[PDB]
Design a binder for this molecule. Structure first.
Ligand SMILES: N[C@@H](CCC(=O)O)C(=O)O
Ligand SMILES: N[C@@H](CCC(=O)O)C(=O)O
Ligand SMILES: [Cl-]
Ligand SMILES: [Cl-]
Ligand code: NA
Ligand code: NA
Ligand code: NA
Ligand code: NA
Lengths: 255, 253
């Protein structure tokens, strides 16, 4: 049967290129939590697949002037991919246009920053400008701020938008580098913060979770794979396989 | 006017309770709690009216291993005796095979409720002994997790619970709490509910961490068009901060 086209994006420890001296080809190039998830889905549901990195390098957001989506979300809308297997947040605006499986991981937006400071919350960032802050451009965190009616988050969006050329970044890796090299706090998903802080002992999460969301496998609207993948996820959960996969990929610091 | 939706639910504090009052209350006005607030928001957002009915058999729902039939709220949905189940109803593999669920409105996991002052630190410590009894709600998701599990510690625990089921499987979380308070018994309980109970009784504690991860969702019969509509409403409520506000209201040692 036809191999499913799977769109994804590079994001440690979910999706990475394998390190090797020999060139690698096709699906053999990739590893990570989401790649292990994809393999399990493929065995349980009985499909073959071809992994393709999203052409525009984006997760996906809607253009405020012309209304078009980009990123992996757009690839699904346009039926250029069968599945998006990635750390792809399930959100209201996305669920209006694509389908998602139920979540394989739960998380929330939080703050990555340096240690040893009096900053304890989003409110503390919002009320000042000396410490800059931002998010990945055209992802779910950005969109949460852009849409929020909550006073603190609306104030933060106004700042991000004003300073966007500097404070909105194209990847989590770029955001981490800004935290490490400038007076900057990065609004980042908590799952990824846990990974980063385990490996960067001078960085920490600031405050708690700002929201609650899950990552799900994306499908075009109406796809029969959506509910089948939900069932496989729920079975993998029940068996303890997702927890084992998280422990494998998240693997510390003195304290 | 459109037919009012029949909403099955179950009494479970602080999700669904009878309001305290001296005058008798009628109809929907009888009920309050997190899930009642959720239902009200869903009805306003999706434009339906409803009638709340407590599940007739008093159960969440499990499948009988001999005759293959479901019970509880799950069975009421299968049989189209209710349009929705709005309750702390766990989304599970075996249930999703036979009913549909919205995406989760709250996440949780199984954990352990026990009295303070103990060296017992985990499910492994419980499984290795028999002086302290342990159990779960009969015909709910926790019981089913143990009954199905192939993980050595949990399979051992199920063998004990099954052997002693007339004593250690209980009919409600409230009965489980009373057993913890009145005997040497540890209760396998969902974490959200433990959080509520331990804030109210400072002699009790959670033991260990979460054994699994799951969500509560609104149940619908398989194929229902309300499922995806309710998912969207829940995602919008999330994004506005209303679910966290509802949790703070009802969970407010
Ligand atoms: N996981 C996000 C990207 C990262 C972020 O927005 O923080 C998404 O699905 O858009
Ligand atoms: N919330 C559970 C009942 C309680 C439990 O099993 O711990 C259910 O949906 O079955
Ligand atoms: Cl798991
Ligand atoms: Cl769903
Ligand atoms: Na990337
Ligand atoms: Na959708
Ligand atoms: Na289902
Ligand atoms: Na004791």
């Amino acid at each position: 049967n036809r191999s499913l086209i799977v769109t994804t994006i590079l994001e440690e420890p979910y999706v990475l290129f394998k390190k090797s001296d020999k060139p690698l080809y096709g699906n053999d190039r990739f590893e990570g939590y989401c790649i292990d998830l994809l393999r399990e889905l493929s065995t349980h549901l009985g499909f073959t697949y071809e992994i393709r990195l999203v052409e525009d390098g984006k997760y996906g957001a809607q253009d405020d002037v012309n209304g078009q989506w980009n990123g992996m979300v757009r690839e699904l809308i346009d039926h250029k991919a069968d599945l998006a297997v990635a750390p792809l947040a399930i959100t209201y605006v996305r669920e209006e246009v694509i389908d998602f499986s139920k979540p394989f991981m739960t998380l929330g937006i939080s703050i990555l920053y340096r240690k040893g400071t009096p900053i304890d919350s989003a409110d503390d960032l919002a009320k000042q400008t000396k410490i800059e802050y931002g998010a990945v451009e055209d992802g779910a965190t950005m969109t949460f701020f852009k849409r929020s009616k909550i006073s603190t988050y609306d104030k933060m969006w106004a700042f991000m938008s004003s300073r966007r050329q500097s404070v909105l970044v194209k990847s989590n890796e770029e955001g981490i580098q800004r935290v490490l090299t400038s007076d900057y706090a990065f609004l980042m998903e908590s799952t990824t913060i846990e990974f980063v802080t385990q490996r960067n002992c001078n960085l920490t999460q600031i405050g708690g979770l700002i929201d609650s969301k899950g990552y799900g496998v994306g499908t075009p609207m109406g796809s029969p794979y959506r509910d089948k993948i939900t069932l496989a996820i729920l079975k993998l959960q029940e068996e303890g396989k997702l927890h084992m996969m998280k422990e494998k990929w998240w693997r510390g610091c003195p304290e």
